[PDB]
Design a protein around this nucleic acid. Structure first.
Ligand SMILES: [K+]
Ligand SMILES: [K+]
Ligand SMILES: [Mg+2]
Ligand SMILES: [Mg+2]
Ligand SMILES: [Mg+2]
Ligand SMILES: [Mg+2]
Ligand SMILES: [Mg+2]
Ligand SMILES: [Mg+2]
Ligand SMILES: [Mg+2]
Ligand SMILES: [Mg+2]
Ligand SMILES: [Mg+2]
Ligand SMILES: [Mg+2]
Ligand SMILES: [Mg+2]
Lengths: 182, 149, 129, 152, 86
RNA sequence: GGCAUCGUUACUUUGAAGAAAUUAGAGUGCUCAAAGCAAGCCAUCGCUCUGGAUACAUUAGCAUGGGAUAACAUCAUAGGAU
RNA sequence: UAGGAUAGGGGCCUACCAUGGUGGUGACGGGUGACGGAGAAUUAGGGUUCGAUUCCGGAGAGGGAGCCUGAGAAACGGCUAC
């Protein structure tokens, strides 16, 4: 459901009804929808038009959704159009350990190591093959990401949606690109 | 360069940037775990288990498919050897050198190599003691070393 | 062995600058190297530079604009207070009109004028002018 | 028992033969009771000093010695003695001409009460007291075993 | 080829790095690959490493496929080679 | 006014305590100066509460803030946290 | 550990017990035409050399030792001995 409290927003109702509805209409996707549905759903319009929706698998159901993320969003195409639905995973970001504070806060799931841990979630069907960081003269560093050339799908027009989503989820400017070779 | 030579060779491996296992790998974690455990039962060792997995069973890198190193997998399963592999092979080489040098007292070049290998053995043993990978009472006794291997 | 990556970075950059190169490659990268380069770029002594992720230690490609005369580290990192900065200025710098000394104070990595502004001290990383 | 000498060992001013009961009488050491005190300075009296049978007049917790002066941390150097250890205090001396530090050390003999179990290389915290011997002027106040402070 | 003043280190030519040492490339990459060797008969799915070190066999007749050498494994003349990739 | 119980240091900032004399330094026309800590003024049965400033003073010690750069052990039999 | 002695802590001394204590981070031993410090000379900075002497602390009254009186001395412009 959601991390704290009992009453979520007014937006999750549409996605919950879509979850309860979309199962009826598939053969394999129908069966494997007994997992915890969502934790939050947030809308965010991108520059110009074609607003986007961001959903949060808790943590553990992320691996099963990689098996359906290829179809689910496509199956979610026959839904509230004007959508760019993207799934991420909610993660703890514990800063706590101070100068003392012998607590270790494992160096795997640190703070802002989640930042690059949500980055490939937004682009799950296309795995990143390269990353560069350019530090501009105004202190306005940008991140350029080379995704795998095997696009073969709608990953081409989601780049600005990914940029807006990352800007509103981590406060970083990211511009995507593709290799010239293949 | 080399610790005990003047060489400057740089030949090594180059792991791919893509940390995820390749798509064509259709082997589950359970099969890899069972294969590693069976190999460790057959007296193999992590370095020579990784190569067997890479060649025969088409597993490019264990840390990718299973998410953890071979030594960690064996230690979690409890099949890990009592002595680290590199120290074991260094001790084996030193034992072979001593066995050969016993009958050739004038071969004053294998004595120098023996000194070098004993120095490497002692350095590695000190490191493994510092990280509690060996008992603090461990000691390399040359006469009884061959019984260990 | 590589005991100070900052010295290797600064020395390679200075050597490339003397030869009139327009780009230089620095390997391996690190956060302190990035902060030193950021200070130098902010004061207008270099231009663009991009960090390349090689998944192991990262490289930096830096664009030179010909404005950098010398840049070099100071080893070991001596500790200087606010009252000693002047003395080091009389040693590492051509004149009081320009030049910069980089300090790693507990408020971050900065130049010596900024350290005097904030009235803080620290260790000396290097210098550039 | 704790009596291993040719004289009976007892805590001073602690009457050991009162007929009236105990275990509820304030100031432990009244009507027959182990006498113990808190040394202050934010130090915790060990349970082995309150519920103990040893007798030590030089112990800071159950003795006649009061801790005042300087508090010094260090590492145990040699503990081959009878209720006394050597504490090694490592520091850095600043050679001014060369603006550089040289490693220095200084051994300090300290008295360790029978409530503290110690080993070579342990991390000890000691506090200055009145002279107890020719060289002993400190009492061990805390012992942390080597290779510790774990948990995350 | 005056010097790197004309080329761009950020975007170097895509073929010159096909020849440099793997460590010395802009981003380190392996020079090997995996191949599914197909025998003359059936059982054509066996997967082998390019720079293999163990003499692999086949379920049918053990059909010795490759010999380990100082570099790429010496595939036999009778065994057909095609490569699998990411 | 609360109320805890805490990785340790180096480094850096701010504070305190810090003998005078000497040194630097403010005032002051000993006729100048080296000096001295005196003096100055309405032309008084006196006044300026006259002044007799201020720094620095390694290192070690005490206390406040900072955590960038460094050193120690702490790091997966859960003997972990709630 | 227990006493003795002291104005008082303490191998300061006695009886018994244990085998410890310091050292290439220089113990131990030797040289000093070595009292220590505040300070002095020269000083771009760093530094080098000096510091018996009037301010602070210590030690001595030809060389050692013992002591009375006294609140305070192992006093010497006090005693006793060599
Ligand atoms: K006494
Ligand atoms: K009198
Ligand atoms: Mg006594
Ligand atoms: Mg005796
Ligand atoms: Mg003399
Ligand atoms: Mg003098
Ligand atoms: Mg005279
Ligand atoms: Mg005098
Ligand atoms: Mg006298
Ligand atoms: Mg005379
Ligand atoms: Mg006399
Ligand atoms: Mg006379
Ligand atoms: Mg006299």
């Amino acid at each position: 459901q959601k991390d704290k409290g009992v009453e979520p927003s007014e937006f999750e109702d549409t996605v919950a009804q879509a979850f309860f509805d979309l199962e009826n209409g598939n053969q394999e996707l129908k069966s494997d929808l007994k997992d915890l549905y969502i934790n939050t759903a947030i809308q965010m319009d991108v520059v110009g038009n074609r607003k986007a929706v961001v959903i949060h698998v808790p943590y553990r159901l992320r691996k099963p959704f990689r098996k359906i993320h290829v179809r689910l969003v496509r199956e979610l195409e026959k839904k509230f159009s004007g959508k760019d639905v993207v799934f991420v995973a909610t993660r703890r970001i514990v800063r706590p350990p101070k100068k003392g504070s012998a607590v270790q806060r494992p160096r795997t799931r640190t703070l802002t190591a989640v930042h690059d841990g949500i980055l490939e979630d937004v682009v799950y069907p296309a795995e990143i093959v390269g990353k560069r960081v350019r530090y501009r003269l105004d202190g306005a560093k940008v991140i350029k990401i080379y995704l795998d050339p095997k696009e073969r799908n709608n990953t081409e027009y989601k780049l600005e949606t990914f940029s807006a989503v990352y800007r509103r989820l981590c406060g970083k400017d990211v511009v995507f690109e593709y290799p010239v070779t293949e | 360069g080399r610790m005990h030579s003047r060489g400057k060779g740089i030949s090594s491996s180059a792991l791919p940037y893509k940390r995820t296992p390749p798509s064509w790998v259709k082997t589950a974690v359970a099969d890899v775990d069972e294969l590693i455990t069976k190999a460790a039962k057959k007296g193999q060792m992590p370095s020579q288990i990784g190569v067997l997995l890479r060649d025969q069973h088409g597993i490019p890198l264990v840390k990718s498919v299973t998410g953890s190193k071979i030594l960690r997998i064996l230690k979690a399963h409890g099949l890990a050897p009592e002595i680290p592999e590199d120290l074991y092979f260094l001790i084996k080489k030193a034992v072979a050198i001593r066995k050969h040098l016993e009958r050739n007292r004038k071969d004053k070049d294998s004595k120098f190599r023996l000194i070098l290998v004993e120095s490497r053995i002692h350095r590695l043993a000190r490191y493994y003691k510092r990280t509690k990978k060996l008992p603090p009472t461990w000691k390399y006794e040359s006469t009884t070393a061959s019984t260990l291997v | 062995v590589r005991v100070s990556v900052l010295n290797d970075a600064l020395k390679s950059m200075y050597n490339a600058e003397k030869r009139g190169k327009r780009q230089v490659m620095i390997r391996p990268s690190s956060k302190v190297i990035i902060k030193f380069l950021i200070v130098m770029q902010k004061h207008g002594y270099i231009g663009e530079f991009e960090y390349v992720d090689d998944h192991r230690s990262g490289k930096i490609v830096v664009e030179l604009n010909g404005r950098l005369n010398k840049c070099g580290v100071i080893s070991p990192r001596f500790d200087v207070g606010v009252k000693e900065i002047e003395g080091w200025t009389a040693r590492l710098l051509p004149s009081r009109q320009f030049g910069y000394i980089v300090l790693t104070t507990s408020a971050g990595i900065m130049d010596h004028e900024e350290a005097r502004r904030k009235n803080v001290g620290g260790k000396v990383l290097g210098f550039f002018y | 028992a704790e009596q291993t000498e040719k004289a009976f060992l007892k805590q001073p001013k602690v009457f050991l033969c009162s007929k009236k009961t105990t275990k509820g009488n304030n100031k432990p050491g009244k009507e027959g009771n182990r006498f113990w005190k808190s040394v202050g300075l934010g130090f915790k009296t060990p349970k082995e000093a309150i519920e103990g049978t040893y007798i030590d007049k030089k112990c800071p917790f159950t003795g006649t010695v009061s801790i005042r002066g300087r508090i010094i941390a260090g590492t145990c150097h040699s503990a081959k003695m009878n209720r006394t250890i050597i504490v090694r205090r490592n520091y850095l001396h600043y050679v001014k001409k060369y603006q550089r530090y040289e490693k220095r050390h200084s051994n300090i003999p300290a008295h360790i009460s029978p409530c503290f179990r110690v080993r070579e290389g342990d991390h000890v915290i000691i506090g200055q007291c009145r002279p107890l011997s020719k060289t002993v002027r400190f009492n061990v106040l805390k012992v942390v075993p080597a290779g510790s402070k774990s948990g995350a | 080829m005056v010097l790197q003043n004309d080329i761009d280190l950020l975007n170097p030519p895509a073929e010159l790095e096909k020849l440099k040492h793997k460590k010395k490339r802009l981003v380190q990459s392996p020079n090997s690959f995996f191949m599914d060797v197909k025998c003359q008969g059936c059982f054509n799915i066996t997967t082998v490493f390019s720079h293999s070190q163990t003499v692999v066999v086949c379920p049918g007749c053990q059909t010795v496929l490759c010999q380990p050498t100082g570099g790429k494994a010496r595939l036999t003349e009778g065994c057909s080679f095609r490569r699998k990739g990411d």
